[PDB]
Tab-separated table of C-alpha atoms in Angstrom:
chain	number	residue	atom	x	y	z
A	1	UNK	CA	-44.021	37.195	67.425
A	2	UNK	CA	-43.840	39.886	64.600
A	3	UNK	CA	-43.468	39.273	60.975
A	4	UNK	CA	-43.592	36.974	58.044
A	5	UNK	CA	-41.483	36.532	55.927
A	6	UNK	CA	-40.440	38.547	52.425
A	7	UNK	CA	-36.950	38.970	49.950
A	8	UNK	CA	-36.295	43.010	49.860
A	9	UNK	CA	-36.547	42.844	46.130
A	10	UNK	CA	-37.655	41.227	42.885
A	11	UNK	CA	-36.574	41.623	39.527
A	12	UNK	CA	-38.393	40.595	36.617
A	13	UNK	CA	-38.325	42.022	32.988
A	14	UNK	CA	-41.083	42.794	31.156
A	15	UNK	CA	-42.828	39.173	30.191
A	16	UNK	CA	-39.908	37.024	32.074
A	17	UNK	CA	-42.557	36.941	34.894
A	18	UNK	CA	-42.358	37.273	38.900
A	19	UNK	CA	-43.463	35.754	41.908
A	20	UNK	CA	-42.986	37.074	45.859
A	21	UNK	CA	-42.906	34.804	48.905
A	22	UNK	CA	-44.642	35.295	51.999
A	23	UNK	CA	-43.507	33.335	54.703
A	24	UNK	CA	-44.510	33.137	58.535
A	25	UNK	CA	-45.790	30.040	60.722
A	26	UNK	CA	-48.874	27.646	61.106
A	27	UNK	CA	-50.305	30.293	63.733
A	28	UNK	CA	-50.991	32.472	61.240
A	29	UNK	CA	-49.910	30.773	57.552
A	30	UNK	CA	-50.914	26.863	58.075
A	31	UNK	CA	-53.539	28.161	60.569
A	32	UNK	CA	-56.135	30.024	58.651
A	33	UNK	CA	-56.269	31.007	54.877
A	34	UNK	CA	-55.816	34.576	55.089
A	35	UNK	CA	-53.089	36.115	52.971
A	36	UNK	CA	-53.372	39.192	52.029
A	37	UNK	CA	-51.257	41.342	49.423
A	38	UNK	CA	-51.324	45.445	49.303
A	39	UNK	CA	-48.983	47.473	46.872
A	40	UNK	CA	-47.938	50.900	47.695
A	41	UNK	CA	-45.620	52.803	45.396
A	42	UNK	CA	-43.174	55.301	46.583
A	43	UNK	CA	-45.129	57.153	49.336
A	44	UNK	CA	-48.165	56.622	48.100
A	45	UNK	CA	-51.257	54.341	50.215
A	46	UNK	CA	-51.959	50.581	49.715
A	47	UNK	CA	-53.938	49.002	47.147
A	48	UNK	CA	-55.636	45.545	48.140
A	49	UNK	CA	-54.911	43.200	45.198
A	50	UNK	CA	-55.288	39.648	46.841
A	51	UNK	CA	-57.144	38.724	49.583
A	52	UNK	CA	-58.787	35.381	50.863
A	53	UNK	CA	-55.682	33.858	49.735
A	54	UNK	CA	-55.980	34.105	46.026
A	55	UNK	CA	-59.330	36.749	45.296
A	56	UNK	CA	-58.843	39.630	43.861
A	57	UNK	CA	-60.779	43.042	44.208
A	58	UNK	CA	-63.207	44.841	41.480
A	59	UNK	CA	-60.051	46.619	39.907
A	60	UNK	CA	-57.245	44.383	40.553
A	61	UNK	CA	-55.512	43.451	36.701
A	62	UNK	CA	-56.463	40.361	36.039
A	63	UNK	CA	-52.190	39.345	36.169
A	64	UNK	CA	-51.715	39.300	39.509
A	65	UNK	CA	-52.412	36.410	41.342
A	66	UNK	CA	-51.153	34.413	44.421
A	67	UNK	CA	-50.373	30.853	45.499
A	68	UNK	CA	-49.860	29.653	48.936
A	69	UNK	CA	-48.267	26.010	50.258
A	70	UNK	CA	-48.388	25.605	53.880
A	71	UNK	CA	-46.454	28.413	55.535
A	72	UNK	CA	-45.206	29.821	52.011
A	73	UNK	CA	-47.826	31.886	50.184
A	74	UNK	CA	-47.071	33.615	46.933
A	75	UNK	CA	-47.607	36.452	44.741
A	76	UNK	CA	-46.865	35.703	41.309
A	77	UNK	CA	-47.026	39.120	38.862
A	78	UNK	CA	-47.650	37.010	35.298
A	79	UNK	CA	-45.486	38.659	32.924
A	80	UNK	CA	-44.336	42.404	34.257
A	81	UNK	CA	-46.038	45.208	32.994
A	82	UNK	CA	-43.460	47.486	34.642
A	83	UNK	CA	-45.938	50.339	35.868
A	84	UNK	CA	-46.550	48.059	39.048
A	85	UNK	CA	-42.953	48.794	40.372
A	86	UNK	CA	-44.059	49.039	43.739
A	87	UNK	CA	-43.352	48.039	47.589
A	88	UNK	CA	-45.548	44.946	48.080
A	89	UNK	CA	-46.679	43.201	51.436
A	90	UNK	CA	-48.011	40.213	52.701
A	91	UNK	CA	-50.376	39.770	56.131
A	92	UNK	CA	-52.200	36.882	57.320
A	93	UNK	CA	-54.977	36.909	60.461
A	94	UNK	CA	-53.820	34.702	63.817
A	95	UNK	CA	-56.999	34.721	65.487
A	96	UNK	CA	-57.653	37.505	68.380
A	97	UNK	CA	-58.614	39.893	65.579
A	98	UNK	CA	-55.038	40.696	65.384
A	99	UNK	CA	-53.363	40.384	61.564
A	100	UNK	CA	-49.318	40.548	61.193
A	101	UNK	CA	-47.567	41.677	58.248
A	102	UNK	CA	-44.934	41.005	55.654
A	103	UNK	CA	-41.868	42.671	55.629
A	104	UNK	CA	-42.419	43.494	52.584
A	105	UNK	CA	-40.591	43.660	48.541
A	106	UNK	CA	-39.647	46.167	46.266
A	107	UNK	CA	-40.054	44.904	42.851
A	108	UNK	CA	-37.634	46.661	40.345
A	109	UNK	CA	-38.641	45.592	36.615
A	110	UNK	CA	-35.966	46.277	33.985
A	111	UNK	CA	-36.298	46.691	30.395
A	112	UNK	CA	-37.640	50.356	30.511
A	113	UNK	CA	-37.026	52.087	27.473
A	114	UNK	CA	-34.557	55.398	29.075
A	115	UNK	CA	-36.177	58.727	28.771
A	116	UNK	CA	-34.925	62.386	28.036
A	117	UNK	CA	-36.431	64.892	29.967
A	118	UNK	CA	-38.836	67.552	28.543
A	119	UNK	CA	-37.552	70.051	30.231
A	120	UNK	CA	-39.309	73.555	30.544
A	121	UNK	CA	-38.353	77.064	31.708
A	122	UNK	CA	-40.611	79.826	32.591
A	123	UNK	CA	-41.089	83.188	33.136
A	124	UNK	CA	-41.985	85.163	36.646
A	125	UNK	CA	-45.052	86.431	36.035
A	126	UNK	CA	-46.644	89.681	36.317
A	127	UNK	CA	-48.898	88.836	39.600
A	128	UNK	CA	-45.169	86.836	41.370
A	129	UNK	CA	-43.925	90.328	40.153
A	130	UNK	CA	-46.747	93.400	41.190
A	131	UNK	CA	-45.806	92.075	44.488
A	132	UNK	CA	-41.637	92.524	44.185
A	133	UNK	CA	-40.878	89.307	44.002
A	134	UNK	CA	-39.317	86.903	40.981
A	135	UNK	CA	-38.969	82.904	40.945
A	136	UNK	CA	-38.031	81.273	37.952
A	137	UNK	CA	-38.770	77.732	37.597
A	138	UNK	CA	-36.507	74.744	35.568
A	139	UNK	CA	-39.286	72.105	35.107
A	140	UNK	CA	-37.670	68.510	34.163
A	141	UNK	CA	-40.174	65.614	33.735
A	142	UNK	CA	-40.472	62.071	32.359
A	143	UNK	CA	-37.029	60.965	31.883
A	144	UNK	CA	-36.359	57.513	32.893
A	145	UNK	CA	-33.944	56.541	34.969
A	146	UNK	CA	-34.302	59.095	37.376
A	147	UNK	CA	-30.481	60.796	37.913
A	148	UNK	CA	-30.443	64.367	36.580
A	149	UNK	CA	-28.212	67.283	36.886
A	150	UNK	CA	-29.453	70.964	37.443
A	151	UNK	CA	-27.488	73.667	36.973
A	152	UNK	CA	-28.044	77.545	36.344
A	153	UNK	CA	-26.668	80.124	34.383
A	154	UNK	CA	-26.911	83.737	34.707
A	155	UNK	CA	-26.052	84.615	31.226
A	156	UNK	CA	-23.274	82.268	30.463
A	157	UNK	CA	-21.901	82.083	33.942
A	158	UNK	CA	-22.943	79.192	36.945
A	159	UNK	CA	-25.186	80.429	39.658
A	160	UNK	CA	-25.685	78.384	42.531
A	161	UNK	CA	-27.246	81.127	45.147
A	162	UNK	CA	-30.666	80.854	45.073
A	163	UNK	CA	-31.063	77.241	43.689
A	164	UNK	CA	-33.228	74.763	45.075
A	165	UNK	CA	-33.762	71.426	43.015
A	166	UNK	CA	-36.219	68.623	44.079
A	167	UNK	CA	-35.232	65.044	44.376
A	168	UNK	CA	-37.062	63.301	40.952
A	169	UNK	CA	-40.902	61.744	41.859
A	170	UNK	CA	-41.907	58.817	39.920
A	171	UNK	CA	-44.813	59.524	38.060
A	172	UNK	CA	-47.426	57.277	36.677
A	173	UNK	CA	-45.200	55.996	34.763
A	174	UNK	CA	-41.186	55.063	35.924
A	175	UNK	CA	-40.767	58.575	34.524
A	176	UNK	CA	-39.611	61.138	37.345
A	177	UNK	CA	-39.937	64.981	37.450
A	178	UNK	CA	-37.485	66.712	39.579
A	179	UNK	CA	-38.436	70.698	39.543
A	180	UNK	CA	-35.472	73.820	40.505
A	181	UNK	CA	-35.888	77.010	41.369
A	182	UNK	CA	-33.688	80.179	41.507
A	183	UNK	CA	-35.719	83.333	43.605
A	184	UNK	CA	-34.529	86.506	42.906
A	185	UNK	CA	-35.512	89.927	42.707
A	186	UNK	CA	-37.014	92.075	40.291
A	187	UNK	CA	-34.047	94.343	40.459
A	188	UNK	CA	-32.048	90.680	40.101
A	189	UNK	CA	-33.958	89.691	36.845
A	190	UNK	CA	-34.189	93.277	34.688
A	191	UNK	CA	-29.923	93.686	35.738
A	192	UNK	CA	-29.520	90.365	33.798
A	193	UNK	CA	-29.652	89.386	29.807
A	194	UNK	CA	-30.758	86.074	30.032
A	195	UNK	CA	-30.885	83.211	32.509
A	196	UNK	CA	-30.230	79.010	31.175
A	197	UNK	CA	-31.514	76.175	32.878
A	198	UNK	CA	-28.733	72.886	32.593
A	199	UNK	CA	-29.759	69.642	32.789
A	200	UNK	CA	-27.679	67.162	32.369
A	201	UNK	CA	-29.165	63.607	32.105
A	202	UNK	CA	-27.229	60.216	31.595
A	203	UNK	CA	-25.158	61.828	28.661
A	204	UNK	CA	-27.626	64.246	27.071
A	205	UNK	CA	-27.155	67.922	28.279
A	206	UNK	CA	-30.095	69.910	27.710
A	207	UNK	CA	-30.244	73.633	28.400
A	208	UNK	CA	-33.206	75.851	28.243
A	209	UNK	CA	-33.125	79.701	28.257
A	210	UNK	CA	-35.400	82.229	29.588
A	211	UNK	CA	-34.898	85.610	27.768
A	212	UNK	CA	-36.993	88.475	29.390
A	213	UNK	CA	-37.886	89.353	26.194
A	214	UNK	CA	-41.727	87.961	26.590
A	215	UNK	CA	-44.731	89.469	27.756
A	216	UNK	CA	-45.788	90.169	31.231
B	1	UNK	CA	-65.632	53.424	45.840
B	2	UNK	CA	-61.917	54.469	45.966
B	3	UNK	CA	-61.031	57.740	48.594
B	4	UNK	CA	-61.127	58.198	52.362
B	5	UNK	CA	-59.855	61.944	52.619
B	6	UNK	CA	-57.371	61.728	54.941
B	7	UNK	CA	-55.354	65.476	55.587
B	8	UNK	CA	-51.992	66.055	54.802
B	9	UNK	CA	-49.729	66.597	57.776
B	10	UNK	CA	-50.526	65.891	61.436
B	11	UNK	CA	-47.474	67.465	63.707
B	12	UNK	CA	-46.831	67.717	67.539
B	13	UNK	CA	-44.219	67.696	69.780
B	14	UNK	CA	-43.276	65.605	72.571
B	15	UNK	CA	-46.425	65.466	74.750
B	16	UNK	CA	-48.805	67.040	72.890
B	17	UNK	CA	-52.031	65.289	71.571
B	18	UNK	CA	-52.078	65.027	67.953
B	19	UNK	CA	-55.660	64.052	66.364
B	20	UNK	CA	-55.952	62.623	62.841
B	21	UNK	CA	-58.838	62.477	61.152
B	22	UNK	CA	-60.709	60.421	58.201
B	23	UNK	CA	-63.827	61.410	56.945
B	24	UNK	CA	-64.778	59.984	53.051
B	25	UNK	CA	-67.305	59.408	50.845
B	26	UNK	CA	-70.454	59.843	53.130
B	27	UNK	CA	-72.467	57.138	50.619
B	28	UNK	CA	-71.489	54.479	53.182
B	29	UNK	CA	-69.849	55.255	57.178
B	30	UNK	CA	-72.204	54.823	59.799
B	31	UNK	CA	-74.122	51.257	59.158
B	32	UNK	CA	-69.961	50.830	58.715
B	33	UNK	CA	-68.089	50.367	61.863
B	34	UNK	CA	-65.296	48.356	60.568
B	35	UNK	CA	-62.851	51.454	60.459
B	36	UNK	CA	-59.430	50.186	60.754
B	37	UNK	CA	-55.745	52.558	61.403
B	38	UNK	CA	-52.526	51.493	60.254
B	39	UNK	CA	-49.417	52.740	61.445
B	40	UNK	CA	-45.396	52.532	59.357
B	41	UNK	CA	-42.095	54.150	59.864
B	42	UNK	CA	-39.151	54.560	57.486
B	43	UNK	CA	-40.175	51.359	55.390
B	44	UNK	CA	-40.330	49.443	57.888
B	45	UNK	CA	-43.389	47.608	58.716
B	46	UNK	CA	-46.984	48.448	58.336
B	47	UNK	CA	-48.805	47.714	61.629
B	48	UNK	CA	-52.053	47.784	62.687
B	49	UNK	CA	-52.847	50.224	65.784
B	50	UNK	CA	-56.547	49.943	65.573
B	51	UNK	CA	-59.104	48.158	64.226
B	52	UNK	CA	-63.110	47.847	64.625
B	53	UNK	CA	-63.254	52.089	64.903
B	54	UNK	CA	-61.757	52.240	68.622
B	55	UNK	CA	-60.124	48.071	69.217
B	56	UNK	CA	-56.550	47.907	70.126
B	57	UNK	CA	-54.673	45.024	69.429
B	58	UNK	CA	-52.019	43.129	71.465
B	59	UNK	CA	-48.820	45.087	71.653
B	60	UNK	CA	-50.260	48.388	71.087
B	61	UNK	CA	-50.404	51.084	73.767
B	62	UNK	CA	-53.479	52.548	74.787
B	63	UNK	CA	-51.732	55.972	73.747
B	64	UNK	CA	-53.090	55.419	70.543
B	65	UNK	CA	-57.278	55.660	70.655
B	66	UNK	CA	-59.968	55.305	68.497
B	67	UNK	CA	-63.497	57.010	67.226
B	68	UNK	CA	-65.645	57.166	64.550
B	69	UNK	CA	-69.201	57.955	66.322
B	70	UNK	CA	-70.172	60.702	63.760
B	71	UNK	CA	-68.631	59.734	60.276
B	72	UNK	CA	-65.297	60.559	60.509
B	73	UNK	CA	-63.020	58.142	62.221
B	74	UNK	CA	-60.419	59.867	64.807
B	75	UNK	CA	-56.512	58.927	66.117
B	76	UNK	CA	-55.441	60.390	68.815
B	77	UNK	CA	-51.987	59.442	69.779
B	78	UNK	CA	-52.669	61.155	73.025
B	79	UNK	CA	-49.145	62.500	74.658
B	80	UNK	CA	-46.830	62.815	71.703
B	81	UNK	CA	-43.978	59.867	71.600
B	82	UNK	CA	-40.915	60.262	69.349
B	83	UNK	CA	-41.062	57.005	68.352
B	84	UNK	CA	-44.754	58.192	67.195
B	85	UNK	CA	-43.354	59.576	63.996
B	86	UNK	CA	-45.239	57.698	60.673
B	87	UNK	CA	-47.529	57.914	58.073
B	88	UNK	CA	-50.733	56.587	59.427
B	89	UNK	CA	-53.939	55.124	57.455
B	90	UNK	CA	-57.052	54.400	57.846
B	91	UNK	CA	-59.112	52.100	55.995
B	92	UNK	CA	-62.831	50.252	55.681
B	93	UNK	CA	-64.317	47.297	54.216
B	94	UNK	CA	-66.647	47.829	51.666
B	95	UNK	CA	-68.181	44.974	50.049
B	96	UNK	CA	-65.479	41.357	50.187
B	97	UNK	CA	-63.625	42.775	46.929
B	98	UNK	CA	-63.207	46.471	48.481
B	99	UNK	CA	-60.941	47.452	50.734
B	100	UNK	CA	-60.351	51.227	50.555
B	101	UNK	CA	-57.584	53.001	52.519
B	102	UNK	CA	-57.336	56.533	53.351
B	103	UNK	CA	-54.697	58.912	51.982
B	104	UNK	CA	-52.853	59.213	55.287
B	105	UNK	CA	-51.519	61.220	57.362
B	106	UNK	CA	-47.296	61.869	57.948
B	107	UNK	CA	-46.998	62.870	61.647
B	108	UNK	CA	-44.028	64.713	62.469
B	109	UNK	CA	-42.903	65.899	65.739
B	110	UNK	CA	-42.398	69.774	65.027
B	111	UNK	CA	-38.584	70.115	64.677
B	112	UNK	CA	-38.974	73.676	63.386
B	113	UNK	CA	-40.861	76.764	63.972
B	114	UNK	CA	-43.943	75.667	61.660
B	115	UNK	CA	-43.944	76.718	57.990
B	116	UNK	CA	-47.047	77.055	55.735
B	117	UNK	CA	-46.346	76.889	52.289
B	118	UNK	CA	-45.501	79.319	49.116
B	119	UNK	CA	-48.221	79.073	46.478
B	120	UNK	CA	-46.430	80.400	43.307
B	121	UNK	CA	-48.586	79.432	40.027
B	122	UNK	CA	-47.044	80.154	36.703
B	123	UNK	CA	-48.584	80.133	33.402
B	124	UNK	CA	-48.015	78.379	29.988
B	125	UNK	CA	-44.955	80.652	28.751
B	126	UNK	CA	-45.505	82.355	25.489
B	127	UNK	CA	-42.999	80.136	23.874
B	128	UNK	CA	-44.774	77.293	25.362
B	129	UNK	CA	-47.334	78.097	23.411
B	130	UNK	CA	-44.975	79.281	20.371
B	131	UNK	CA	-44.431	75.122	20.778
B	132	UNK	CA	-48.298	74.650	21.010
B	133	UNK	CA	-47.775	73.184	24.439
B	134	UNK	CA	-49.347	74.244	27.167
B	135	UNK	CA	-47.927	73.644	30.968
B	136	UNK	CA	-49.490	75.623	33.747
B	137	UNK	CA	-46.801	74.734	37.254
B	138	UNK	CA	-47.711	75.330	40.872
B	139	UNK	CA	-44.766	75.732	42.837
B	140	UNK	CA	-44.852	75.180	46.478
B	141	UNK	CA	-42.174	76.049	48.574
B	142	UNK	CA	-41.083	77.132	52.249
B	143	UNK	CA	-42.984	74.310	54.223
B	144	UNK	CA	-43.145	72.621	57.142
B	145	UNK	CA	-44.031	69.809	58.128
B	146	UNK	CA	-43.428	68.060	53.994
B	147	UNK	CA	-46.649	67.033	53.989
B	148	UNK	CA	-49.275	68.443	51.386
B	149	UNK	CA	-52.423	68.339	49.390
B	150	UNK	CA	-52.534	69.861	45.888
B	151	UNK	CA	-55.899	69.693	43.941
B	152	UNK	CA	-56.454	71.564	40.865
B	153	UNK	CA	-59.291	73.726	39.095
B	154	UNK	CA	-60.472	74.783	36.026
B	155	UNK	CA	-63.235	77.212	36.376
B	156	UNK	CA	-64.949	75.641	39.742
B	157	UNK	CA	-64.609	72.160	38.854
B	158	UNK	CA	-61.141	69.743	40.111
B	159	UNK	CA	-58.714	69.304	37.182
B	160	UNK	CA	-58.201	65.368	37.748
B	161	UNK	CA	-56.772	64.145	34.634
B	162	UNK	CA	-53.622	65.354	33.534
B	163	UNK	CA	-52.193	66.271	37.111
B	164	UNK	CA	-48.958	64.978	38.222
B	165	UNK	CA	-46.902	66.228	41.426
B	166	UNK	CA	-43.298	65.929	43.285
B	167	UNK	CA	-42.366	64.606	46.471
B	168	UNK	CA	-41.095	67.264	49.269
B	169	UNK	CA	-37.799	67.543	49.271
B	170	UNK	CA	-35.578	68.891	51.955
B	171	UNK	CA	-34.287	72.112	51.049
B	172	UNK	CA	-30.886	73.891	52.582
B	173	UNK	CA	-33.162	76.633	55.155
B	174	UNK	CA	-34.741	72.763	56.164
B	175	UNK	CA	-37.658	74.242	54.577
B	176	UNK	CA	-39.309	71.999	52.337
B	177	UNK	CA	-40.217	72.186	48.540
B	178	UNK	CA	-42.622	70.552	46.336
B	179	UNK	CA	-44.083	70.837	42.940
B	180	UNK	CA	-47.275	70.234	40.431
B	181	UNK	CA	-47.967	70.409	36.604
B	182	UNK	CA	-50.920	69.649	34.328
B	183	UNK	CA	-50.482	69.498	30.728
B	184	UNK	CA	-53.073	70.618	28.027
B	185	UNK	CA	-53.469	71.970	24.441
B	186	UNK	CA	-53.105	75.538	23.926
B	187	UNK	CA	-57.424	74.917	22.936
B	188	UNK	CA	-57.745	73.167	26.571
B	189	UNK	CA	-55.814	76.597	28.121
B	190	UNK	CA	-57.675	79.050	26.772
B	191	UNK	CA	-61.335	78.132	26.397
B	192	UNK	CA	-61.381	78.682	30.249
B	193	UNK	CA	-61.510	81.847	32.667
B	194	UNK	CA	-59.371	80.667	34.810
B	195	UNK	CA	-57.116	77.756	36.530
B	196	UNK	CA	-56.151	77.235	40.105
B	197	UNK	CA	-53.699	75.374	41.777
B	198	UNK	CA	-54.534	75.069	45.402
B	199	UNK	CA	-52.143	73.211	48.297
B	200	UNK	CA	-53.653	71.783	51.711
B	201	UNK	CA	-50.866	71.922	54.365
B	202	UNK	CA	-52.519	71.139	57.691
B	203	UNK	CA	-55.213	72.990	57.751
B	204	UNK	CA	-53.844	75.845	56.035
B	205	UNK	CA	-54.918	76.073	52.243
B	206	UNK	CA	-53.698	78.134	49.913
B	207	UNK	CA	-55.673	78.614	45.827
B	208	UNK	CA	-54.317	80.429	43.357
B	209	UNK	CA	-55.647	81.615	39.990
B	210	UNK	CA	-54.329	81.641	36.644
B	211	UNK	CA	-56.390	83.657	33.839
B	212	UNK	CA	-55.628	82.565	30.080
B	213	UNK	CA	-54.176	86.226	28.521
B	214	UNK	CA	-52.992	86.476	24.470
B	215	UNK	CA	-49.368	87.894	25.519
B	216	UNK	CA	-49.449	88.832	22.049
């Protein structure tokens, strides 16, 4: 063998309410009462939130639950609460001390309020600098849904050159933060008047400038 | 109880012996042999390699071993695989409502010359502050293999609350970057010597301080 059974997705709004399947055979789902359901969110490790079929561990929201008929067991998520956008799985024993696995369902919940990001620019530093060296950093964080722009402007020209923008994490919340750097030189930074940070998300441009003019 | 500490990146090449560890929170391991290592790929399915601190299961080669005799449990994929690429976890059974996985471990096959990572902390910009917010960002950049630990510190003691990091993104020099904030009152900033970000890579580390100045 290899798997149970699982739909790649599940969308349910806020309230509206959702339920996974879990599906395999009587060897393992029929035989024995032993599903189990872990969540793990982009990248992150598994929580156990139902085991023993439907019991739940000393921290799992009292929401989640689970069902199971025959070969199809169930997760039901009673009434979306949005933060649990996650990759669920199911898993069920078949004797030899040998459990299989579900293939598993990402659970996209819409109804998310969109974000604009509070985006931040700094300044070098006087350390990043004693040592000849000068990164400036564009910081973008919880804007919801997670497509941003990031563009740089030495004075009000583009750079592209030393850019380097990250790919937007989700947060603990379906808010992302997707940081960019430019890495120049001292002699780069003092031959310049300013330097704008452009980020353009889902309409709203936002642009933040660093000035030299600051401390150290 | 929540954490197994689990490191960061475990990286070979083809034939080499890569060892991954788990060691956790010592109030428990030893009258606890139930250790248990999971294995995924790409999103796509969440096996079991070992079980019972050192028990393969059917289907599993006995490339993959198992220890825990001292109180850390120990992988060894013993002559590197390609197909041995994955984020691997361990896990153990506390009391019937506790299951508690590890952080686990990406293994990568070392396609690159190694790369330990670029510490660069900034502080809360003066205008920041001129906003009465107060963002302290640790950069990390350069790395190889995108796998990292970032903790934080205020003044000897981890900064837990208000922490929130990126995921490592693939970066044109196939480098990778990453990123951390925390977010305080201008109060929280400076009624403290100093803050540290500080990034695990392997078994590399890197901690870098922060000092609260008036600018002005």
């Amino acid at each position: 063998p290899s798997a149970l059974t699982q739909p790649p997705s599940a969308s349910g709004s806020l309230g509206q309410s959702v339920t996974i399947s879990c599906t395999g055979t009587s060897s393992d789902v029929g035989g024995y009462n032993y599903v189990s359901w872990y969540q793990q969110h982009a990248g992150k490790a598994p929580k156990v939130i139902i085991y023993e079929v439907n019991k739940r561990p000393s921290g799992v929201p009292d929401r989640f639950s689970g069902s199971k008929s025959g070969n199809t067991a169930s997760l039901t998520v009673s009434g979306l609460q949005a933060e649990d956008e996650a990759d669920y799985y199911c898993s069920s024993y078949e004797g030899s001390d040998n459990f299989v696995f579900g293939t598993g369902t990402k659970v996209t919940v819409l109804g998310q309020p969109k974000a604009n990001p509070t985006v931040t620019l700094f300044p070098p530093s006087s350390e990043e600098l004693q040592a000849n060296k000068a990164t400036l950093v564009c910081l973008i964080s919880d804007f919801y849904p997670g497509a941003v722009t990031v563009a740089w402007k030495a004075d009000g020209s583009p750079v592209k050159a030393g850019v380097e923008t990250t790919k937007p994490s989700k947060q603990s919340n379906n808010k992302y933060a997707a940081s960019s750097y430019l890495s120049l030189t001292p002699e780069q930074w003092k031959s310049h008047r300013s330097y704008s940070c452009q980020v353009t998300h889902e309409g709203s441009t936002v642009e933040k400038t660093v000035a030299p003019t600051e401390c150290s």
